[PDB]
Ligand binder design. Structure first.
Ligand SMILES: Cc1ncc(C[n+]2c([C-](O)c3ccccc3)sc(CCOP(=O)(O)OP(=O)(O)O)c2C)c(N)n1
Ligand SMILES: Cc1ncc(C[n+]2c([C-](O)c3ccccc3)sc(CCOP(=O)(O)OP(=O)(O)O)c2C)c(N)n1
Ligand SMILES: [Cl-]
Ligand SMILES: [Cl-]
Ligand SMILES: [Cl-]
Ligand SMILES: [Cl-]
Ligand SMILES: [K+]
Ligand SMILES: [K+]
Ligand SMILES: [K+]
Ligand SMILES: [K+]
Ligand SMILES: [Mn+2]
Ligand SMILES: [Mn+2]
Lengths: 336, 390, 390, 336
């Protein structure tokens, strides 16, 4: 593996990330009698086991399979939500969210605005496996968040761990705006830690500083947070460099203030993500930070991203923005 | 004898392709002839006088409003308009067969359904003018109506997107034990979109109480139906998805009513979808941006839903020329009163461009709103400010 | 008498919904029984011995390759695999009825069509291994085969996208006066996508020489057809679009051949689409990532296409146990020879991650390629370099 | 109007922008017997008259209407192009391109890469009306280019005038990669100038400096080029400030070198576009320029963009990044 995972609220149990998602969905159906979960192959527990046991517990009318049609899954979910009921739609891989792009962008995101708040689909959440998995190639590896970041009216949220995933998913489910929640699939079984059994929330539009530091700010989300945590360790050890490590968590609306506050302190910023460089979300963070922290910047902001190609099968190890690529970019930024 | 999971069928030992029946398609259900005469007494709904008068008055008040608003657009007073000419019977015949609280999703050419549900003239005109009375806050193009109180979901321009949405709202109603049906209107061009195949199939497999109502008016802008499909219209598609289907004369308000009323009764009882294809003809231009003579009446003069209904009223002794003349004057006056009021109202405060993007206003969007306010403070003489509230 | 542009039909004076016939659906065309016996002599294609032996050998060489590659995946030697078990008759029966140069679009479970067209074992295995011999340059997941020389368009994972693409390639062939047909294979789950409705309707209205071939194998991963649709399968959808349609026993190579051969003849002559739904059963897991016992044989033991074909060969005196034993050994040897070669080949140069994104390489993408090269110069000990060419 | 349009190759005639598109399409069908043009309502000449006369000239098999289904129009066009024939698809408003987003992003863009160049759809061009029009509201005003900019394998091109549109459209048609050509519809009748009758090309991935200047670089595309040309005039007059005015022309792959060369000279950059700020293409230009020209930048890079809302009907005059908004941002950047 290219990463290493490392691990107030009542009793906890050790959960991997798929189990934390099941736990969030179970808590939601238990407390909200209107909530349903639907999509391809969810009834038997899903292709990644995220819905195991829920149809038996809550009933076939609340956890059910749809026909194989993503534009329909999202349009159907908007309509459930227009009536006020919680609709938790699954899209089987984020790579297959594109047939539903018109329903997300032209419809879900715009529903409240265009009606003057006469109608809305706030009670819709779309959850989808995301990011690279070692051998997923072009259509089981994608990270589509920058496509959605350019659409006002939706929220886009990505967790880095089991504890984070349950708390952020419950916040998505309960938020009054249509939300896309992307689950890093390479963590579904790998990442396991203590997770509260009872429901809890983590706020949206709020980054988390997971390690304080004074020389450079590193920003990432999803599995790539674990990559930059290791990069921070490598920098301390090899270079005597103190890195502030930040998980962005929500892509939009994003926490501009936490990132700028960090860069005002450190003077230096590196952003990293698996998605391609050009048009990726690091470009929005980099310009904004340049706009707000111009006087504090000691070096150009660095973006260490996937290359501008489709996601390859056999060349995956050469494609991803791994710890060596991030480390080397950091070293040059420190030397600048 | 065949054992396959995907179909229930017998074997056949000879090779035979299944041919579509397109020359002799699904017949067109009719109740009254073009002279307003009931053809088959067993099919007469015998609707009471006051209700048949409401069908008629709704159609003609809509027609009065269409003529005035089309003119207003031609003068540059509103930015866009779409008329309902020729299709007024499909709207009122169907809306009269619904429960008041049945949820409606539409396309853009179904304003008679709102008129039947007593949507105020002031609110049709507020939306077309984008004025302070518009509950849509001036944000959408004209004719993009919506009303939460009358269960009419806001119209949006992207075609067919409401089809799978309507199915989800119907699934939710089933769960809620609502005793409510959802109706979803769309045209024959919209039915070519992938979202129509999504909604039809989901409504059948998830067993939803929904009526799909297709207005087949022969054209989608410039495209005749011969370039839209090659099967027997939209009605012949329903059975393929396992949907009970019917084709009606959309210029016959009673055929439309009967089919809608029976579809509603069975959809709610049985949790199953129904499809009605109402055959009609688009008398108007597609919109104010279209000059339809560039690509194409008997229909206006010889088969019009309003004329057919007027002949029926006369046959019962329920209308006459004196009444016709009085109502034409009163309807013009009512429409002109609302029109004048709408034109004199200001537009909403420009701050409303920023609300309702999300339920709350994110701090970075508030920053943008503040930036506009600062901007107008310095440069406002360059903006049409005296037309906007506050 | 009705005058409406959108349909050709008579009036009806009584209200009658059209009901789908789902319990008695479109019958399943059969030629030979489960014991390899011809049921109706008038339907026997009387294919010559060498061709029937090629159908049989193709199916069993595919089956041999599937068993070995599935095992290779379980051991971690390739990253993914999908078998063809139970569906081998649909592939070879149809491919044998095509012209060699007819263009094929598929889904991922049609490898027998390439095997029939003599695609080398070395190239199936190069693609699954991502090695230097793969003309796909190691870029896609295993089983995403393509061959320009044998007119088999590269497979892609997104379901149904090839359906409207196949229709466009058929329109182009019509224009070119090609005397060629396009065939487009997809499963019954894929047929629920909006792109299937797009392709079916376009092929009918633009009059394209295309066969739509649906493998209905009862499941789409875990989803049974009862949750996929509620009409009479996929065949009953065709006539709604004006497409000539047929349902066949997909475990009968001769029924599949006859239907494909006649559809090809008429599609090319008439420039009209045909739809064949081949009823079959997915004997394998969906893929190496699926354990199908989590959601569900008679089929493997009592209705298998390979067994049925083997019984036919015996009846003609065209096969025996000695031949069976010899071919099983020879096919295992051929597959094992290619397997060993594939495992020993290196993977392609990592520079190939950057080519063919555009035809040319844009200067900013070259800059990225150079950046990788610099990176590997310093940090290459941390990468699996000794496995990659150059 | 919010803008003012201002106006080697053989004979020219005065053409507006819809006529220049017809002229490009006519020249293409004349010299390439494989070329076809298809989409909704193109046969009678199109809703914006871009195909008037072409079906009569070239035949009903070459200029034809499709059913109303954009996912089908694009998938059909890819398939024509897979056979080697030129496919010129129309999408009726750019706002309705989203149903075809999966066919563009997962299929057209990836077709050559994923096949190892065994198959391609290089001979596909998709042309679509684009940008604001005074009263188009949410679904007849959109500028979707930043959605596509994050997809390696497609090219995205936007002209500012009739002369530019014909030369860039012919380059799109003839380029061996799938191209999206967005036609600013507010210029279809407004902008008229001399246009060569015979075919000519303008290169893709090449910005044009339309006015040299020494104090600030301004970058835009489409109608907004005319806005920043006026802003340059306002700055010279009111502030004694010399602006270099650049039309980017191609969104991807974009001309990084021309923009950086300009900013190295001027020290200051303002980018403007109608599309929403967040995730818009100005963010890619701003970070890249910061990365390459860090030492030359005298002030933060400015982005003057549409607000992060859907595109409104009655509030259009307050929404767009007009000359006063750009001018004011420039004035502050000069004062910095
Ligand atoms: C997804 C998509 N694609 C294209 C358009 C453009 N457009 C429309 C479009 O731009 C529009 C829609 C609403 C208001 C203003 C403009 S309408 C239309 C033709 C629809 O034909 P129909 O379904 O038969 O109904 P009618 O009652 O009018 O006969 C088209 C093509 C569209 N609105 N949405
Ligand atoms: C647009 C989209 N949505 C979902 C998937 C996931 N996926 C698939 C997917 O992830 C996949 C596809 C190819 C290789 C590896 C993985 S396959 C599938 C089930 C299709 O059922 P079918 O059409 O009946 O054919 P079969 O012969 O297998 O019975 C699903 C659901 C997909 N590939 N594309
Ligand atoms: Cl996976
Ligand atoms: Cl002014
Ligand atoms: Cl290592
Ligand atoms: Cl317009
Ligand atoms: K939500
Ligand atoms: K709509
Ligand atoms: K595909
Ligand atoms: K091209
Ligand atoms: Mn129509
Ligand atoms: Mn299947």
């Amino acid at each position: 593996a290219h990463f290493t995972f490392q691990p107030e609220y009542g009793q906890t149990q050790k959960m991997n990330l798929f189990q934390s998602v099941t736990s969030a969905l179970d808590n939601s159906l238990a407390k909200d009698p209107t909530a349903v979960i639907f999509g391809e192959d969810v009834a038997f527990g899903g292709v990644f086991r995220c819905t195991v046991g829920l149809r038996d517990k809550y009933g076939k009318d609340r956890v059910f399979n749809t026909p194989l049609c993503e534009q329909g899954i999202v349009g159907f979910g908007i309509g459930i939500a227009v009536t006020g009921a919680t609709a938790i739609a699954e899209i089987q891989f984020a790579d297959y969210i594109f047939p539903a792009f018109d329903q997300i962008v032209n419809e879900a995101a715009k529903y409240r605005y265009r009606s003057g708040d006469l109608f809305n689909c706030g009670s819709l959440t779309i959850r989808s496996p995301w990011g690279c998995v070692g051998h997923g190639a072009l259509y089981h590896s994608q990270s589509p968040e920058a496509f959605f970041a350019h659409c006002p009216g939706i929220k886009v949220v990505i967790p880095r761990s089991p504890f984070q995933a349950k708390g952020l998913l419950l916040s998505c489910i309960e938020d009054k705006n249509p939300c896309i929640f992307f689950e890093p699939k390479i963590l579904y079984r790998a990442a396991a830690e203590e997770v509260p059994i009872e429901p809890y929330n983590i706020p949206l539009s709020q980054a988390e500083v997971i390690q304080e530091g004074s020389d450079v700010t590193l920003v990432a989300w999803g599995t790539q947070v674990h990559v930059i945590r290791e990069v921070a360790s490598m920098a301390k050890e090899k270079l005597g460099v103190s890195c502030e490590v930040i998980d962005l968590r929500t892509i939009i609306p994003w926490d501009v203030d936490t990132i700028c506050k960090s860069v005002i302190k450190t003077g230096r910023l590196l952003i990293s993500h698996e998605a391609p460089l050009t048009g990726g979300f690091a470009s929005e963070i980099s310009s904004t930070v340049q706009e707000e922290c111009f006087l504090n910047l000691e070096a150009p902001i660095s973006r260490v991203c996937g290359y501008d190609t489709p996601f390859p099968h056999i060349f995956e190890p050469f494609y991803i923005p791994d710890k060596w690529k991030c480390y080397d970019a950091l070293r040059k930024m420190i030397n600048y | 004898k065949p054992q396959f999971p995907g179909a229930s069928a017998e074997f056949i030992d000879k090779l035979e392709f299944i041919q579509p029946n397109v020359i002799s398609g699904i017949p067109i259900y009719r109740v009254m002839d073009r002279q307003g005469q009931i053809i088959n007494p067993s099919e007469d709904p015998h609707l009471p006088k006051e209700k048949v008068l409401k069908l008629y008055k709704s159609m003609t008040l809509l027609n009065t409003m269409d003529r005035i608003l089309y003119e207003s657009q031609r003068q540059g007073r509103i930015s866009f308009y779409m008329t309902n000419y020729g299709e007024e019977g499909t709207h009122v015949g169907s809306a009269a067969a619904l429960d008041n609280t049945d949820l409606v999703f539409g396309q853009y050419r179904e304003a008679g359904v709102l008129m039947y549900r007593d949507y105020p003239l002031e609110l049709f005109m507020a939306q077309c003018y984008g004025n302070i009375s518009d509950l849509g806050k001036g944000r959408q193009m004209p004719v993009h109506y919506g009303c939460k109180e009358r269960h009419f979901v806001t119209i949006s321009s992207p075609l067919a997107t409401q089809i799978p949405q309507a199915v989800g709202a119907a699934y939710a109603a089933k769960r809620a034990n609502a005793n409510r049906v959802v109706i979803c209107y769309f045209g024959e061009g919209a039915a070519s979109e992938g979202d129509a195949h999504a909604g039809f199939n989901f409504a059948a497999t998830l067993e939803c109480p929904i009526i799909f109502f297709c207005r087949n008016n022969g054209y989608a802008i410039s495209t005749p139906t011969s370039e839209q499909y090659r099967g027997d219209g939209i009605a012949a598609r329903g059975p393929g998805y396992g949907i009970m289907s019917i084709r009606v004369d959309g210029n016959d308000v009673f055929a439309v009513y009967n089919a809608t009323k029976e579809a509603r009764r069975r959809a709610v009882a049985e949790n199953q979808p129904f499809l009605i294809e109402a055959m009609t003809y688009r008398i108007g231009h597609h919109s104010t941006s279209d000059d339809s003579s560039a690509y194409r009446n008997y229909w206006d003069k010889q088969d019009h839903p309003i004329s057919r209904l007027r002949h029926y009223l006369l046959s019962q002794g329920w209308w006459d020329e004196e009444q016709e003349k009085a109502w034409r004057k009163q309807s013009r006056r009512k429409v002109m009163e609302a029109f004048e009021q709408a034109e004199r109202k200001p537009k909403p405060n420009p701050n409303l461009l920023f609300s309702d993007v999300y339920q709350e206003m994110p701090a970075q969007l508030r920053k943008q709103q503040e930036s506009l306010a600062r901007h107008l403070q310095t440069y406002g003489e360059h903006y049409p400010l005296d037309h906007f509230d506050k």
